[PDB]
From Swiss-Prot, chain D:
Other information: Present with 14600 molecules/cell in log phase SD medium.
Job of this protein: Glycogen synthase participates in the glycogen biosynthetic process along with glycogenin and glycogen branching enzyme. Extends the primer composed of a few glucose units formed by glycogenin by adding new glucose units to it. In this context, glycogen synthase transfers the glycosyl residue from UDP-Glc to the non-reducing end of alpha-1,4-glucan.
Name the record gives this protein: Glycogen [starch] synthase isoform 2
Modification after translation: Phosphorylated by the cyclin-CDK PCL10-PHO85. Phosphorylation causes inactivation of enzyme.
Sites where the protein binds alpha-D-glucose 6-phosphate: A38, R42
Underlying gene: GSY2
Shown stretch of the complete protein: 546 to 625 of 705
Quaternary structure and interacting proteins, as annotated: Interacts with PCL10.
Localization per Swiss-Prot or TrEMBL: Cytoplasm, Cytosol
Amino acid sequence: EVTTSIGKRIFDHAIRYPGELLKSSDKVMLKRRILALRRPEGQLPPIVTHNMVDDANDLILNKIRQVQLFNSPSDRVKMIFHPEFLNANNPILGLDYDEFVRGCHLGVFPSYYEPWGYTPAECTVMGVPSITTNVSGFGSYMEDL
Amino acid sequence: SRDLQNHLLFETATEVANRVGGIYSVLKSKAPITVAQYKDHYHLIGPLNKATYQNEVDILDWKKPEAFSDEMRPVQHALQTMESRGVHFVYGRWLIEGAPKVILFDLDSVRGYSNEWKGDLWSLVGIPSPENDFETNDAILLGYTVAWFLGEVAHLDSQHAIVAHFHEWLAGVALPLCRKRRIDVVTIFTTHATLLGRYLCASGDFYNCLESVDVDHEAGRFGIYHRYCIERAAAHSADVFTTVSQITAFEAEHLLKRKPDGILPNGLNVIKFQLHALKKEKINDFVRGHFHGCFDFDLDNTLYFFIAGRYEYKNKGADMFIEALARLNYRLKVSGSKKTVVAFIVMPAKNNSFTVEALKGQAEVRALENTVHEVTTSIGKRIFDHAIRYPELLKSSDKVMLKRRILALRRPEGQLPPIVTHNMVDDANDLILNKIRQVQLFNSPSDRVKMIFHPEFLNANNPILGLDYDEFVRGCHLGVFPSYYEPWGYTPAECTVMGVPSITTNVSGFGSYMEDLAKDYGIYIVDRRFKAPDESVEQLVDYMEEFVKKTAAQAINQRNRTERLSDLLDWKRMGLEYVKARQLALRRGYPDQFRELVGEELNDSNMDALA
Amino acid sequence: EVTTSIGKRIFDHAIRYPGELLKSSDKVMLKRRILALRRPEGQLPPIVTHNMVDDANDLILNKIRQVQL
Amino acid sequence: AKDYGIYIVDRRFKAPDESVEQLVDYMEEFVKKTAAQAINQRNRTERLSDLLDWKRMGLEYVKARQLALRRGYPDQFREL
């Protein structure tokens, strides 16, 4: 809203011929919005996007908990657990699975038991580098090429 | 000595820089128009809320000489004296449109003077202060501070007349003190409800025999006596007493014992609410996916009613809405009407998001939509490539995928489109749910009114009803707010501003206020005050019916008309009423200097009697 | 127009459960458009897109005219 | 009349010059119109729209065809 206003003002000035281009109205609403982004003191970006039914005992959580990847500025790897299917019409990570895969850089599937593994395979089909395993069907098959 | 023409204004409320109620929205939305008039002569005062003020306030340095003008030095010194005595505060800009200046008193920084004060109160207005009431504790804290601050300003300022406006009981204690200490300010007290009001209408009779209730006794019965006394004492000690509505004014007179001197109806920043075709389609999408497998009605013949607001079952008239809907069914069945009414209920309740059933319905109708799209754009490419190249358009490939999607839409044997989009936490006790059960609006194909309880705020980026509240309202046809207790009614009021017909009530502030300023303008007023409950339910049904049996012509007109009422609700106009109350205070405060400023002795019993 | 009409008809049928999809109104506007495409006898697609000022003497035109494309 | 966004200049009875002036008078009043008066006018003319449809105007061909038939066969008509 603020930038399209700036644009109409730049354009009017220009079409008329013959250093604060933001009026104080626009500064108020901008300020408020930057301020709404403040993290309560020492609150860190969550490692989960959902309310877990079995929070204490969940394996994934307690594993990122044990290795302590808690998303500190210090940490160069950020950890996001998303315990649900991806859907384009979601308030949080709005994207169908196929869109999300495509927008990612690297798929990582360190499967132990996987007679085939349709998941890495179709990661590959979408043109997205993948890490799989030689006890994964698709991996073992990939190994022979 | 004192200048009435250019005076000071101080507006005080629990809510100024924290949204803890409705009054927040009144002060927020009113700011622009009042800052435009007072500039830096206007300041708002409230309790600094430490959890939130940093998100709402541009905190300023009030010590710097640039902070105030010379003219306004008194407030700076006044603020100084205050921090001398250990009273901490924040001075700054409330980061809303208009950016009025604010003074946020730190109640922690004065909780010492607690006991000294609860007592000085009693020895002056006989107001008890039980210590297990944290609200009143802070209410006293705030009052003593603000009355303090106003003393200092009054004393220090030899130039300006000082108007000081207070909103609601929680911010009322400064009022008794001001009148006792004969402090040289004119004061106004606006109440936006009443304590006896809200507590009497908690169960379910009122408007008939409040004229005959023992106030001192009921208050005691609700463990509210002391709160009650703070509200009353604020109403009597003020130079000018006001309510937000004519109907709240009726309440007050008989419950507080003082006839308001006027009405301060809540306006809106109309601007900030500014297309129905386009949002109606989004509701058409939700409906097609909700009624998949039994979609047997014409959407070009379907009207969308809705109710919205806080989940107050009795107070906001949910019961009267549903009941009146069940009857409106009958009247449409029995007349063999051709039309269909889908009535939504948008009242936030305790829940666990959307039902598997509701989500599924939507995803399959999206799939259908996507499949038809694919298939048709193929048809086009094959129609085009034939024409241009001159001299069953569906291959069987397209026939397969079509067949599948259609099939997915099948409704299990006898299952009906749900009456809820959500997993209710309290499914057995929930009043809305149990009402619609008891009247049996279950969304059968017979039923000419369908029912859809959406127990959560609407949000543009949702999987089911993908609309922001503002878009949704515009997409509807009629808003139905059959309130029983509603001192103003912000919800009917921004229905009208958005350009959408509405049914409200003569015991609803905005309703009563509207009754004065008929139905051809998109406003229906059910009489909940005088008719017996049943004849009330019948009139609501009568209005709905009339609105259904309406030709596309008559309706397009109504909307063009109510689209015009929009501007009569802007602060730019509704504001004049606050001006009238500020000037009434000034003419009652300084009868003489006022007389000189007109030429004559204008009348001083009402705000209306004045202008 | 025609294919979005078709589209809305397939979609309605489908949202209802429980070979000429075009109604005759559509076959009319289509026939017209198709018919408009007719070249007058033996007229070929022009080798130029503009009216020339110096048509007879222009080197480009006269060269393609010479090699008969 | 002019409230439905239809202005008619009398080019028939007034002399050329008083026509010109009436045309000017109309344009003027139109300029000096608040954007609310104007929005109302447009909403009004938008309603004259449907009175110009053959569904309505067709009645006039009907009326005429029938008069052709009431005049051509007076007797079979009287009976009908």
